[PDB]
């Protein structure tokens, strides 16, 4: 099927009240054979995270291409960047070569440093634009999370209530899929500091 789906794993992201919840798993491997228990999909530069889902050729290697233009933005502007602004560089990079495009849909989640409005972003492997006020996910198991937060998430929830919603939905979504599992790390995006909390799930 998808060559980038040989590894597996997904990145879940949501939007709360003055808070943003985003999480992924630690699973990395080839087909049904896992390799890395320490692998982390979420990357962070600035005030906004970056999730990535797909083949490590387009995950870890292209990560130097993201920070290539990001650091140039940092060494020149010497300021922050809105999630909508950095998302255009993502989409434009995929449509430069239509025959050779990269197969990793990123996930972008952060809180505005100017107006203070939480916003989430990130696209699929082709670069199709999907932006909502609830949740934006990607990957093969992202089909599950489309209906999970519909019966779970509620408008204007506290960061602690939002933490329990994204955690419980991600742990059960990984047990149902062979491409996700082996621990789940959750990051709580606030205006300034970010809190990291490790979680325990079903091993096998």
């Amino acid at each position: 099927s998808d060559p980038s789906s040989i590894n597996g794993g997904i990145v879940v992201a949501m939007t709360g009240k003055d808070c943003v919840a985003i999480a992924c798993d630690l699973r990395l491997g080839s087909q049904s054979l896992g390799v890395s228990n320490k692998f982390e999909k979420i990357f962070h530069y600035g005030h906004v995270f970056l999730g990535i889902t797909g083949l490590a050729t387009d995950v870890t290697t292209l990560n130097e291409m993201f920070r290539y233009k990001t650091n140039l933005y940092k060494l020149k502007e010497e300021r922050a960047i809105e999630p909508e602004t950095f998302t255009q560089l993502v989409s434009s990079s995929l449509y430069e070569r239509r025959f050779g495009p990269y197969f990793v849909g990123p996930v972008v989640a952060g809180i505005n440093s100017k107006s203070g409005k939480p916003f989430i972003a990130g696209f699929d492997l082709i670069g199709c634009i999907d932006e909502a006020k609830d949740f934006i996910v990607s990957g093969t198991a992202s089909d599950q999370l489309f209906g999970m937060c519909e019966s779970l998430y509620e408008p204007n929830l506290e960061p602690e209530d939002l933490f329990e919603t994204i955690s419980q939905a991600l742990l059960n979504a990984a047990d149902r899929d062979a491409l996700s599992g082996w621990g789940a790390v959750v990051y709580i995006i606030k205006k300034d500091e970010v809190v990291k909390r490790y979680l325990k799930m079903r091993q096998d």
Binding site: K76, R79, T85, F86, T87, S92, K114
Partner: protein, 250 residues
Amino acid sequence: MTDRYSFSLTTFSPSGKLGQIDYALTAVKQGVTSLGIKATNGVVIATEKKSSSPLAMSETLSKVSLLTPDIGAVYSGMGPDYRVLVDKSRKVAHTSYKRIYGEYPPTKLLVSEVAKIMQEATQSGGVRPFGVSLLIAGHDEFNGFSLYQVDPSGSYFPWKATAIGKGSVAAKTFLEKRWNDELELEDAIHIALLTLKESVEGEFNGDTIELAIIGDENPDLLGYTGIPTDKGPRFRKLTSQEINDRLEAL
């Protein structure tokens, strides 16, 4: 087969500066007089339009163009040297963060990329520099408004109130005399008229004096009634009658 001349421009004279740049300021002193000021309530870009024939209509001539809706620009000296820059700037800005990001880079680093090409014209073999100096204002994100002067070398000049062109030394001191914490939009117009117009002579009308304001957004300039995520094209230019109306206020 074209461009067989690989040699650079005039080398170092027994001076310490470049002779191509020194003679470039001659056209600036013999060119139109331009100025600019940042009042934080608005940015007024005013200049003069030289008409040497009565049959020449100044409606076609626009010395202040729009690269981006929040950034105004004005030049001095040779007219067509700026026209080619506009054609090049809009193409380079198209390959700039306009395509990369959802917004163009701020005036500070956007002009530096454009002015970098002007310095490349002073170096690479077979190209020749210009004789013009550009005053480029603009509106940034965090820093609000901005004003910058551009020599033919292309070094950015973060000024507040400056003036170039013919009689720039006499017109620059007048801008240094009138200053305070924060000015206004209309005050910058009246100060420019008491400076630009009274410095030169022979053109008393508004067709030969081009003035534009920045920071005023009219609802008719958006073109759509949809959700206004952004204010709009803060750049605004007075018409032929509105410029003469500013003269009756002094």
